[PDB]
Write a protein that binds this ligand. Sequence first.
Ligand SMILES: Nc1nc2c(ncn2[C@@H]2O[C@H](COP(=O)(O)OP(=O)(O)NP(=O)(O)O)[C@@H](O)[C@H]2O)c(=O)[nH]1
Ligand SMILES: Nc1nc2c(ncn2[C@@H]2O[C@H](COP(=O)(O)OP(=O)(O)NP(=O)(O)O)[C@@H](O)[C@H]2O)c(=O)[nH]1
Ligand SMILES: Nc1nc2c(ncn2[C@@H]2O[C@H](COP(=O)(O)OP(=O)(O)NP(=O)(O)O)[C@@H](O)[C@H]2O)c(=O)[nH]1
Ligand SMILES: Nc1nc2c(ncn2[C@@H]2O[C@H](COP(=O)(O)OP(=O)(O)NP(=O)(O)O)[C@@H](O)[C@H]2O)c(=O)[nH]1
Ligand SMILES: Nc1nc2c(ncn2[C@@H]2O[C@H](COP(=O)(O)OP(=O)(O)NP(=O)(O)O)[C@@H](O)[C@H]2O)c(=O)[nH]1
Ligand SMILES: Nc1nc2c(ncn2[C@@H]2O[C@H](COP(=O)(O)OP(=O)(O)NP(=O)(O)O)[C@@H](O)[C@H]2O)c(=O)[nH]1
Ligand SMILES: [Mg+2]
Ligand SMILES: [Mg+2]
Ligand SMILES: [Mg+2]
Ligand SMILES: [Mg+2]
Ligand SMILES: [Mg+2]
Ligand SMILES: [Mg+2]
Lengths: 172, 168, 170, 173, 172, 171
Amino acid sequence: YFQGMTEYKLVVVGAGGVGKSALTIQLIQNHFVDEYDPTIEDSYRKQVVIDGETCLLDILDTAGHEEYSAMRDQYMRTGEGFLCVFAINNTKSFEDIHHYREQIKRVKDSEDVPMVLVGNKCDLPSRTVDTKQAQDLARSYGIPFIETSAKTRQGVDDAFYTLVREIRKHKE
Amino acid sequence: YFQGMTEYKLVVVGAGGVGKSALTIQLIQNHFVDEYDPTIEDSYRKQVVIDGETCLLDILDTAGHSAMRDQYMRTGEGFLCVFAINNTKSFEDIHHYREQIKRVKDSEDVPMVLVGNKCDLPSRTVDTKQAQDLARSYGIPFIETSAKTRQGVDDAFYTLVREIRKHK
Amino acid sequence: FQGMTEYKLVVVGAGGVGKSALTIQLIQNHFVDEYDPTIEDSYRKQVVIDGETCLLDILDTAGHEEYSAMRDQYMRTGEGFLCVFAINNTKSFEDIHHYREQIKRVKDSEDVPMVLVGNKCDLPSRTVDTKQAQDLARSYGIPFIETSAKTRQGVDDAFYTLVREIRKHK
Amino acid sequence: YFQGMTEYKLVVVGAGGVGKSALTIQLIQNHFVDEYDPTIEDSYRKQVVIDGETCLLDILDTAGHEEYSAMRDQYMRTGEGFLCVFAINNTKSFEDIHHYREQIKRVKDSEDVPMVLVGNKCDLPSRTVDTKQAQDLARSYGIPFIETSAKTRQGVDDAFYTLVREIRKHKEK
Amino acid sequence: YFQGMTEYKLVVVGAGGVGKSALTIQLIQNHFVDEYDPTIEDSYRKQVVIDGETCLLDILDTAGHEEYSAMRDQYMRTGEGFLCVFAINNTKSFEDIHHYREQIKRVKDSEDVPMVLVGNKCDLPSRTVDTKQAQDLARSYGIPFIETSAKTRQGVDDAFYTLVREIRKHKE
Amino acid sequence: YFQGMTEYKLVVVGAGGVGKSALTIQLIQNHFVDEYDPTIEDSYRKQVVIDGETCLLDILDTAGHEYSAMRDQYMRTGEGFLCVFAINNTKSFEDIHHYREQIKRVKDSEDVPMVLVGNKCDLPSRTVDTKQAQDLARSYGIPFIETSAKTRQGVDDAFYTLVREIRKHKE
Ligand SMILES: Nc1nc2c(ncn2[C@@H]2O[C@H](COP(=O)(O)OP(=O)(O)NP(=O)(O)O)[C@@H](O)[C@H]2O)c(=O)[nH]1
Ligand SMILES: Nc1nc2c(ncn2[C@@H]2O[C@H](COP(=O)(O)OP(=O)(O)NP(=O)(O)O)[C@@H](O)[C@H]2O)c(=O)[nH]1
Ligand SMILES: Nc1nc2c(ncn2[C@@H]2O[C@H](COP(=O)(O)OP(=O)(O)NP(=O)(O)O)[C@@H](O)[C@H]2O)c(=O)[nH]1
Ligand SMILES: Nc1nc2c(ncn2[C@@H]2O[C@H](COP(=O)(O)OP(=O)(O)NP(=O)(O)O)[C@@H](O)[C@H]2O)c(=O)[nH]1
Ligand SMILES: Nc1nc2c(ncn2[C@@H]2O[C@H](COP(=O)(O)OP(=O)(O)NP(=O)(O)O)[C@@H](O)[C@H]2O)c(=O)[nH]1
Ligand SMILES: Nc1nc2c(ncn2[C@@H]2O[C@H](COP(=O)(O)OP(=O)(O)NP(=O)(O)O)[C@@H](O)[C@H]2O)c(=O)[nH]1
Ligand SMILES: [Mg+2]
Ligand SMILES: [Mg+2]
Ligand SMILES: [Mg+2]
Ligand SMILES: [Mg+2]
Ligand SMILES: [Mg+2]
Ligand SMILES: [Mg+2]
């Protein structure tokens, strides 16, 4: 019997300063955070309707650089789906993506972990990572790619909702 | 791909005067209709959330008292079979509604809920136990309702949606 | 703001008083006619109470349970308690004292958010008068609400009132 | 041009103790008030959907007996529709209804004022006003009658929603 | 009396590849479809509140080039309002608009059919159709013009809600 | 006791043509108004959820250039103010200090909930630098948000941020 809404555990990962927090806060509060306040670990909750199903999103916002690596392994084990975020004006953040992905696959001992590749800050004019390169990378992993802006809200709901759909597909 | 909410086609049947319209209008408008205006055929819609899933209920309210009857039985996915707990004849009619539905749909396992309406009234002629035994014999849920007090109204419709979902 | 406020509610009272039926009416808008004894079950629902969005975590307990350290442990997680009796069952009403003492013991406090709930008000076999229950609640400084899980009278109100009691305490 | 939801100013009137406040608080908070705390004047707001239209209910809960009569005139002038409440166990409250209706018509200087007759406390066993008598009275005025219980919530939404429907009919005249 | 929400039958028309599907999917799923999968015929539904009225939108997503022309006439007869979509980087799609409009008017035997002119892909830098020219075209038909991006979601709700308002004006 | 949702009286001020109406209509109707129809006075309402609290927003849309007793009246009744300039209109930005001083004078307070709004951020012809606006907002101790009534960038955020500023002030 139904005891309450389905819950999804989402984890947002990626390099320092790519906009992990800004994406999450835009989703939760409809607020753009202009300041750069480095994260240690924050967790958020939101109830949404996706494809006609009520969902409770539990979202873990992670540090760009995680010092205690056992803590990183713990959230990778518990997370059901991952947003892997880079910034489209930060080539290094893009090159870091494969490390996040490998870490997740290693910890979960699986090649098929729900994930979405997110190219954030698409509102900025100084793009250094081409859409084509990101799409090719996502295709090589068999995952969706979405361009986002925490500032304009382009793609924000879509990135989170797409990840829930990937989790749902994986469980079906 | 998701093209919009799930739709459920529900049909409310039973003898004249048992409260089919009053149940439906209570669900849709939160209004109790005190007058008895016999129905020909009316259809209503409401979006609800049941067990975390959004769905569009299409509800067909039928006349108590035949090609038109067959047509709505064919299109219906689930049926509320309503009698009034102060009307023994309406209860005895339930067997006929059930057989008609099974015949038309060519199925033994058609989502249905047995509804004993007007449970607010003191002059009960149909025992709860008798209705429960009948529902058990059909393998369907039984619910007592009052379109006047709203007791069991949402439950009757939501239960029927749950029966459709089980069947699908 | 990291998301809605959560409230941990625990439903206690004697065997058969309608703790599960009240909870399932809240969650599913369904009346359960069958009596399936509970050990421990948990439910969740988001509601709006006094303009504030709340996530309710509801723990539905066993009415017949000997001393358990494990019982004490889950009860200690509760922020507020519905203490339920049935208005046709005098012994369930007399057992309310025991539930109240248990809650005070486990929470190690005299001031625990609670609501007294007199369930099955639809039945003709009332043995506990409204005034007696109101007097008991007044003696504890808590609200009394009469409910019927069958008609749904007072169901939302019992849970929402408990949330208001928790908010007052915080 | 849409500037936000339509607002309806609803006023709840009737004799002392008939359950005006209990009805309103049941609507607003889903809470039954067992205590009898006599009202002076309180205002409540709730957004609801009625017949597919979103609207803001501004509800003025009044005193049974209003001492300052200019204050009474003021809310009757501003009110767009009125719930006239009696209690089904209180014959005097029912006999008062005609006078509340006449007071409203006098203040508004109109014969066609949106109103609903509400017979409250229908959960109680010692009924002194028969349903038929209330229905006959409502029919004589051309208005809806609804039986309510602020305790069980029977008819509560219906009473308020029906009044909004009466206001809409009057406005669409 | 009231038997449940008002239903509006909306039809999305225009040249191949202008973003008819992408607009509809953005509205329904808050998802941007990056791939180009040519449509035959798809129908979608959504309940929304527009100007305080609860509406059930039935949206018919059409093919750019309709081969069976009796099928085209049938959906034009049943549709209550039309989004006529072009892409602001595709001059040909803009020059085609008058053909779609004439088809609709011919089938409905009316000069007063609820319609909105939609200039889609306004996120792209390679604009070939000037806003002023589109506004002038809309003005010549007596209909609203809205610039949209199925990608950023700019104007998407507005285009559909504006069409519902046009239908309501025609019904009253 | 709870009598229904909390109401917030918001007032939108700023020079003629900066997009006060367009911002408000975007919020209320999800509609971008392309035409320039000068405002006299309009009031709008919307119920929203902000940080888990249901709020009724009462929004007063004002004339760029005002009868000054009428101006004083809405400034007295307003609980919070969006002070709007257009990022392509230097003069509208220079006017901001006058609106702020008027509000502080009328409300006889140095601590009035306000948000500085740089509107039309979709346009390419920017004449007011973000740094200058941020410095000005910081000098007043208020939030700064860039908006576009056209793209809807920042629109909800401007109004919701102002409600959060009012809530902070009311404790
Ligand atoms: N223009 C623009 N700036 C953005 C966007 N997302 C984030 N930023 C900015 O980039 C900076 C870093 O954002 P932040 O969310 O803190 O990054 P983070 O990835 O959470 N960092 P950390 O790993 O240290 O926790 C902030 O100044 C923020 O305003 C975006 O989409 N567009
Ligand atoms: N007391 C009470 N009266 C009820 C209840 N349900 C319906 N009624 C009353 O019974 C009468 C008939 O109800 P109605 O809805 O019209 O019945 P129906 O089954 O739709 N009739 P038909 O088959 O002619 O369309 C009315 O006077 C109505 O108010 C109920 O639960 N309790
Ligand atoms: N008439 C009526 N029966 C009720 C009501 N609430 C519960 N019941 C019935 O009482 C029986 C026991 O209810 P239930 O919810 O299982 O009780 P419980 O308090 O959860 N029992 P346990 O402690 O063993 O888990 C069931 O048959 C149920 O239908 C009520 O308000 N009215
Ligand atoms: N049983 C029952 N009691 C009710 C009902 N409505 C109100 N009461 C009770 O009757 C008493 C008076 O109710 P209240 O709402 O204060 O009445 P009022 O009309 O607002 N009084 P006043 O005119 O002084 O403000 C309270 O004790 C209340 O609990 C009802 O439907 N059922
Ligand atoms: N950048 C951008 N691309 C868009 C936009 N809308 C659509 N596209 C892209 O344009 C292509 C065609 O879009 P699609 O929705 O299939 O077009 P259509 O009008 O439905 N095609 P058809 O008539 O064949 O069914 C896809 O690659 C899609 O991603 C938009 O607003 N911006
Ligand atoms: N590109 C763009 N144009 C905008 C934006 N906001 C407003 N405009 C345009 O600017 C013009 C003036 O907008 P309007 O809302 O009337 O300004 P106002 O500040 O309310 N004027 P007034 O003080 O006379 O009432 C209109 O043509 C409108 O479309 C925006 O964010 N971007
Ligand atoms: Mg961070
Ligand atoms: Mg009928
Ligand atoms: Mg139990
Ligand atoms: Mg009162
Ligand atoms: Mg297509
Ligand atoms: Mg203006």
